[PDB]
Amino acid sequence: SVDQKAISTIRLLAVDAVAAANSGHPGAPLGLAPAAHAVFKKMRFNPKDTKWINRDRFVLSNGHACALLYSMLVLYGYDLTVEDLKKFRQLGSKTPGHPENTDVPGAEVTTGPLGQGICNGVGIALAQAQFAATYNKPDFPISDSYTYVFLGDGCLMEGVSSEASSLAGHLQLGNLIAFWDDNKISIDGSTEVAFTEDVIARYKSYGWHIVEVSDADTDITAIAAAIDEAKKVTNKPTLVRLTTTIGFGSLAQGTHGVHGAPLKADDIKQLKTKWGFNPEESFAVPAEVTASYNEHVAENQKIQQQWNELFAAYKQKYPELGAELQRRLDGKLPENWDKALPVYTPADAAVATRKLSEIVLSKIIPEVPEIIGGSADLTPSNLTKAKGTVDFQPAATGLGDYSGRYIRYGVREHAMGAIMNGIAAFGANYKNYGGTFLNFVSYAAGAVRLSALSEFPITWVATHDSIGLGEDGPTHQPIETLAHFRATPNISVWRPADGNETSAAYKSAIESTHTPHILALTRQNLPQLEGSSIEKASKGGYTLVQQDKADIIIVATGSEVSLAVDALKVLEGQGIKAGVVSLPDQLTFDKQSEEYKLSVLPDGVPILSVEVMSTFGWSKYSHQQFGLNRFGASGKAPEIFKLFEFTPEGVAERAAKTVAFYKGKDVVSPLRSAF
Amino acid sequence: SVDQKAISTIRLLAVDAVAAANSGHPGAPLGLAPAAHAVFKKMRFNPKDTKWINRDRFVLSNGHACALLYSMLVLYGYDLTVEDLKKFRQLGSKTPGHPENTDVPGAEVTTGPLGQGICNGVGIALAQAQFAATYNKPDFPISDSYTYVFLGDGCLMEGVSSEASSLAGHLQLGNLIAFWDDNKISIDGSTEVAFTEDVIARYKSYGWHIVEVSDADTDITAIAAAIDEAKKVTNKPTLVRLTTTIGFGSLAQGTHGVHGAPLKADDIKQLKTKWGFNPEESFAVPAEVTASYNEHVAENQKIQQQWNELFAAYKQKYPELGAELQRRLDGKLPENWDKALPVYTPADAAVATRKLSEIVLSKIIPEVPEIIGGSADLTPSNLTKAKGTVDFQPAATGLGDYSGRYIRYGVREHAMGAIMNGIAAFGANYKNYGGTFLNFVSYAAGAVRLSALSEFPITWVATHDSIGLGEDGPTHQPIETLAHFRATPNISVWRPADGNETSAAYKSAIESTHTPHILALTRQNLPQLEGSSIEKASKGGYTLVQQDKADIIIVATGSEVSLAVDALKVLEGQGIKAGVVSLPDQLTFDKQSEEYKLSVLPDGVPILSVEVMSTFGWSKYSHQQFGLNRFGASGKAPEIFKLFEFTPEGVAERAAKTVAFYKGKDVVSPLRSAF
Numbered sequence A, B: 001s002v003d004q005k006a007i008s009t010i011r012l013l014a015v016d017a018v019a020a021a022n023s024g025h026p027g028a029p030l031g032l033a034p035a036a037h038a039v040f041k042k043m044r045f046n047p048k049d050t051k052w053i054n055r056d057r058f059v060l061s062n063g064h065a066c067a068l069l070y071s072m073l074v075l076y077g078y079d080l081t082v083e084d085l086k087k088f089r090q091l092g093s094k095t096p097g098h099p100e101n102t103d104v105p106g107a108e109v110t111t112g113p114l115g116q117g118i119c120n121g122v123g124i125a126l127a128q129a130q131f132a133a134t135y136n137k138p139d140f141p142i143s144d145s146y147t148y149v150f151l152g153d154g155c156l157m158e159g160v161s162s163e164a165s166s167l168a169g170h171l172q173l174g175n176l177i178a179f180w181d182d183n184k185i186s187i188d189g190s191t192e193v194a195f196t197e198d199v200i201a202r203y204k205s206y207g208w209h210i211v212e213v214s215d216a217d218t219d220i221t222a223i224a225a226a227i228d229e230a231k232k233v234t235n236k237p238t239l240v241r242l243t244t245t246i247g248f249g250s251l252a253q254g255t256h257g258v259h260g261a262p263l264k265a266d267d268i269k270q271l272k273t274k275w276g277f278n279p280e281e282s283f284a285v286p287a288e289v290t291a292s293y294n295e296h297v298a299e300n301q302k303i304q305q306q307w308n309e310l311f312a313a314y315k316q317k318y319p320e321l322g323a324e325l326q327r328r329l330d331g332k333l334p335e336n337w338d339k340a341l342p343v344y345t346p347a348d349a350a351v352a353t354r355k356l357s358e359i360v361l362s363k364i365i366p367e368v369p370e371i372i373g374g375s376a377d378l379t380p381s382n383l384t385k386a387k388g389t390v391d392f393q394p395a396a397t398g399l400g401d402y403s404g405r406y407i408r409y410g411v412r413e414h415a416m417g418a419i420m421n422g423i424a425a426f427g428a429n430y431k432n433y434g435g436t437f438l439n440f441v442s443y444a445a446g447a448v449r450l451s452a453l454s455e456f457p458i459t460w461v462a463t464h465d466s467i468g469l470g471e472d473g474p475t476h477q478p479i480e481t482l483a484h485f486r487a488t489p490n491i492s493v494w495r496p497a498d499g500n501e502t503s504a505a506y507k508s509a510i511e512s513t514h515t516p517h518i519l520a521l522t523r524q525n526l527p528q529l530e531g532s533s534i535e536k537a538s539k540g541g542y543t544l545v546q547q548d549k550a551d552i553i554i555v556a557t558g559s560e561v562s563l564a565v566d567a568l569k570v571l572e573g574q575g576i577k578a579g580v581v582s583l584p585d586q587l588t589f590d591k592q593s594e595e596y597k598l599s600v601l602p603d604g605v606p607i608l609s610v611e612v613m614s615t616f617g618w619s620k621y622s623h624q625q626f627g628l629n630r631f632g633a634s635g636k637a638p639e640i641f642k643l644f645e646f647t648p649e650g651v652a653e654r655a656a657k658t659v660a661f662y663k664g665k666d667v668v669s670p671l672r673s674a675f
C-alpha cells in the first residue's frame, strides 16, 4: 500500500543518511518509522509556515534518532531537502547529528541530551493550555493543538523526565500525547541490565492515561487508534507504549549494535530488496509517497487558511483580546510596557534584591499578559508570585485555572528549566520565568545550557545568591555558579546591586528574544546607590563613581557594589582615590562598543574586582581579583563576610596592595588583548 | 513511659536549638521524632567509634531537619553536646544549618540539597552488599548492616531520587530501609498544589516493598514492626510511609509556617507543659532518657566488641582475605599497586585517552580490590569495564552477582554521582568511579559539588571531552564544563594528554582520600609525547619542552598539548622560540610549592594558554588565552578544529601576536599577585 511504501521510504532515507555520513543512529529510526508516519498523518502543520500558532507540535526526545525526523521533514516539503540529508552530520549542514531548533526547520526544540524533549513537550502543552484558556471563546477555538512526543528508554531513565511527568499528570495536560519506544535496548544492551521497573505502572501513578500498542513494528491502525483514544481523555496526558524492534528489518535488528553505528552495506541491500526498493539506489523518494504526503499538506494548509479567517473574525468579535493576540503573534511587547518598571532614588530604603524582584513582577505582570512563571517550591523565599494572581492549575482541582499566571513547579528545578524552554518554544511572545535558589539552578544545568544553545528568552529568578544568605550554610551558598553560567555561551547573568539595577535586569530579561537570563538576587538588604539608573545599568557595566584622578578602579557586582563604595571612603582616609564600576551583566557589557567599554575600564589605572564568589572570568575586566574560592559557612551572614574579609577595610587593604603592586609599571586596560 | 519522655526530649531539644539560633526548621523534627527514636533503638552503632565498618548507617535526606539528627547524636553521646546544640547555625559550630560529614560526628554524608541523601543511602547499601559478598564466609557475617534513610516530599519530587530508586529496586537492595515523612506539606503549602502522584504505587513499580504506618505521630510500635517486616524482605528495598503531622504538637502544626522558621515563644511554652517539661527551661535532658539511651549504647558496644573478635577469628580462618580486609580498614592501598600503571614511550602508537583509561582500569582493577565502578549507559563508549569482570547485580537475575565489580547505572548521571558519594561514605577504602560523557557530568552537578564539599575520593571517567568528538555536535561538546568544575573548591580536573599523563591521573584519583576527581578524556587519538612521564605529570603541571631562550611559553592541556608541540615547530620557521607546559590538573599544580610553580611559569616571558573550551580560569597561568567560548558544531572533528583555527598555524599566529603585544613591556609570571 502507499502507507507501507511511505514507511519503507522513511526507514531507507534514515539508513542512507547514516550511511553517507558513516556516523549516526539507524536503530530507533527503523523502529519508529511506522509511528512517525502515523503521527505525522494525524498532525496539523504547514511546512511553509513553521510558526503557525495553532499547529500541532512534535518533539523527538530521543534526539539521536533525528535521521527519522529529518526524513519526515524532507518528505513533507519543509525547507530541508534530500541534498541536506546527504550532508547529515557534516560541518555546516542543516542536518546536524542531533536536532537544533536554530538550524533545522521544523525542529521545535534542541534535543540530544536525553530526557529534555519530553519535558519540553510538557512545557509546550502547558503553554498551549494557558494560551487557549486566555484567548479561546465560544465559536472561537483559537488554540486547540496537541503536543506529540517520541521518547525512549534513556529519556525514561533520566530523572528530569520523572519530574516533568509527575507535574504533567498533576496538571491534567490532556493535549500531551507521548510515545515510548519500548524496544528493550539501550547502549549497554538489554534494559534487563539496568531498567526493569514497570514503566506503565509508574505512569499510571502520575495520573497518565495509557494505551499499549503491542505490534508497533507494523500496526499503524492501532497507533492511529491510540491517538484517537488519547484525544478523548481530556484530563490526563497519555503515554502510548510502542512495542518495537530496534533496527526493525536489519540483519542486526534487536541488538545494541544497531543503536548507534552505520549498518553494513550488505544489510542495507537486503533491507531495500525486502521492501521492494532498488539495492543500487540511495535516497529514493517514490513519487507516490510524495503525492500522499502532499495531499495531507494541502489539507493542513486549508485548515490554516480557515484558522486565519477565524482569527480575523475573532478580532472583530473580541476587539481587545484580538489586538493583544495580534501584538503577541507579531513578537512585540506592549507599547511603553517598561514605564511600569519601578524606579528608585538614593533616598529610598535598603531592600533585598529578591524583594525588589517581587515588586518588579507585581508591576509588570498586570501590564504584560505574556509573562507567566513559577517557583520550584520556593515561592515565599524567592518572592516570585504577584499578589492577587491565580495559579496555573486545572480548574477541576479548585486550586487555580488554566488561565492562571503562576506555576507551582514543586521541588523540580531541572524539569522547571526544561519546561521553561518548552513554554518559550510554544511562541506567542511568552516571557516565562522560574524561581529557585541560585545554588540549585545547578540541578537544572542540563536544561539551562539548552536554553542558551536554543536561544530561548527564559529567565531564572535565582535568589539567595551568596554567603549573604547566612545560616543555611555551604550546601546552599554559591561559589562556582556564576562562573559556570557566565562561561556558557549566550547566558546573560544579571547580579543587580539595587532597585534601579533590578529593573534594568528585568527590562533585559523581558525584552530578550534569543538570550536566556539568570537574575542572581539577594536574601539580604542592599542600599539604593548614588549614581544608578535603569539607563546606565542597561549597558551591563557602567561607571558608578567617576574619579578622574583615580589610583584604582574597583569593579563589582550585586551586593559587593555597596561594599566597594564603602571601601572608597576608607581608601580616601589612606590617601588613595578610587573609582567604582558596577557590572550587573557581563554579557550585556561585552556587547557594548569597544569605546564604551574602555570608558568604563580605561587604560592607565589598576583595576580590582570584588565579588563574593569565584574569581573565574574576572580577569576579563580586572588586573587583580578579590573573590571567594572556598566553600562558605553556616552562621549569621555579616559574620561570614567578616570572616572572609569582605568588609570595607578588607577591600581597602587589597586595593592599597594593588596600587602598590603596580607602582612603576605601565598598566593597560584588561579589555586589551593580543588577538 | 521512658520512650514517651525520650520522644518529647528530642522534640524539645530540636525546637530549643532552632529558638536559640532564631533560624532553622522545627516542623519535620517535631513530626519525625517518634520515628527517629524507634529507628535509632533498632540501629547498631558506637558513638565512640563512628567508623565501625559493620555499623548500621542513618541518612537524613531531608537535611533541613538536622536539629533532629543533632539531638539524637547528643542524646546518644556522640562527640556533640548540648553546648553544641546551643550554637546551632552559628559561625564555626559543630551544628551547621544542614549536616556536613566533615564537621558533624555521626553525619555519614552531607545533605541539605534535596534528593541527595536517599541516593547516598542507595550507594551505602550498594557498597555494603558488594562488601558482604566479597568478605562474608560461613559463620563469618563480617558485614550484615542496614542503611536507614529519612526523606520527605521534597526529596521525592527531585528527579535524582527517582533515578536512584529505580536502580535500587532493580538491584534488589534488601538492606535499604527508607522512611517517607508523609506530612503533605512543603514550602509552597499543601502537596495538593504540586505533588499529587501516588508515591506508593510508584515505589511498587520500581520493585520496592512498602509498609504503611498510618499514625506515625505516636505509633512507635508500628514503626518498629515496619523495620522488622522490612528486614524479612531480603530482595527488595523497603519504603516505610510515615503519616505524620508536620510540627506535631505546635499550635501551628500541619501548616507550611512550621516548616522553616522558629516557633513563637508561647508555642514552645505550651509544647513543654503538654509533654510534662518545664516551660521555663531550655535544652532539658531528663536523666531517665540518658540512662535508656546509654543502655542501648552499651549493648551496641558489646556487639562491636564481639565483631572485633569475629574479625580476629576471620583473619585466622581466611588468612588471605583477612589481610586484605585489614589493609582496607587501615585505609591503605596495596603495597606498590602503582607498579601496575601502564607506562608509554614516544615510540608507542597514538591512542585516545578513553582507550588509555580502559587499559589503566584493566591493569589496576585486578590489583586493587576496593576499586569498583560503572557507567551511565555508556560502557562501550567510555570504555569503563575491564574485560573479564562480572557486573554488580543480584544473582537472582543471572546477570551478575553482588561480588561483581562493574555497575550498570543506566541513563542516570545524577544518581550515579550521588551513589558514588554513598559508596565512598561506606568506607573500607572504596575507590569508585562512574563513566559518562564530560558534557553530561553537568546533569549530576548537584552531587558533584557535594563530592567536593564532603571530601569524597570519587572519580568521574568523563570521555568525549571536546569538539574532538565530532559528529554528535554541540549538544554533546563541552565548552563551559571544565571551568565550572575547576571553579568549584576541591575538585581535581585531570585532562591528560597521553598515556603517561593518563596513568598519573589515575594514580592521583585512586590515591585520593579527600578530593574528587574528574578525568576529561578524548574520543580521538593523541600521540605519545616526548618528555611526558608519570613522575612529571603527577605534579599537575610541568615543563614538557624547556626552551632557555624562549620568546613565549605555550601552556596547554589534553589534546591541545600535541597541538602546542606542533605549533612550536611552525614558530621555529617564523624565528620564534617557544617552550611548552602541560597542565594536566590545575588543582594539583596549584598545591605545589611556589618555587616549583615558578619553574614551570617563570617571570620574564609571555605565556599563551591553549585549550579548546572556555578561557575562564586560564589567566591564573597565562597572559593571553586561546580557547573556544562559543558552542561547537556537528561535523568530522578535524574539520571543526580547522574551522576554529585550533591548528598548528592558528596557534602559531596567536603566539606570534602575543610576542609582538609584549614587545617593550615588562612581563611577570601570571602566578604573581598583589595579595
Ligand SMILES: Cc1ncc(C[n+]2c([C@](O)(CO)[C@@H](O)[C@H](O)[C@H](O)COP(=O)(O)O)sc(CCOP(=O)(O)OP(=O)(O)O)c2C)c(N)n1
Pocket (backbone or CB within 6 Å): A027, A028, A062, A063, A064, A112, A113, A114, A115, A152, A153, A154, A155, A181, A183, A185, A186, A187, A246, A259, A260, B376, B377, B378, B380, B381, B382, B411, B440, B443, B472, B523
Ligand atoms: C543526558 C544524556 N546522557 C547520555 C547520553 C549518551 N547516549 C546517547 C548518545 O549520546 C546519542 O545521543 C550516544 O548514542 C552517542 O552518540 C554514542 O555513544 C557515541 O559513540 P562513540 O562512537 O563516540 O563511542 S543515546 C543513549 C542511550 C540510548 O538509549 P535509548 O533507549 O533512549 O535509545 P535506543 O532505543 O537504544 O536508540 C545514551 C546513553 C545522552 N545523549 N544524553
Ligand SMILES: Cc1ncc(C[n+]2c([C@](O)(CO)[C@@H](O)[C@H](O)[C@H](O)COP(=O)(O)O)sc(CCOP(=O)(O)OP(=O)(O)O)c2C)c(N)n1
Pocket (backbone or CB within 6 Å): A376, A377, A378, A380, A381, A382, A411, A440, A443, A472, A523, B027, B028, B062, B063, B064, B112, B113, B114, B115, B152, B153, B154, B155, B181, B183, B185, B186, B187, B246, B259, B260
Ligand atoms: C535541591 C533543593 N532545592 C530546593 C531546596 C529549598 N528547600 C529547602 C530549604 O532550602 C532548606 O533545606 C529551605 O527551607 C530554606 O531554608 C528556606 O526557604 C530559607 O528561607 P528564607 O528565610 O531564606 O526565605 S526545604 C524545601 C522543601 C521542604 O519540603 P519537604 O516536604 O521535603 O520538607 P518538610 O516536610 O516541609 O519539612 C525546599 C524546596 C533545597 N534545599 N534543595
Ligand SMILES: [Ca+2]
Pocket (backbone or CB within 6 Å): A152, A153, A154, A181, A183, A184, A185, A186
Ligand atoms: Ca531503547
Ligand SMILES: [Ca+2]
Pocket (backbone or CB within 6 Å): B152, B153, B154, B181, B183, B184, B185, B186
Ligand atoms: Ca513534606
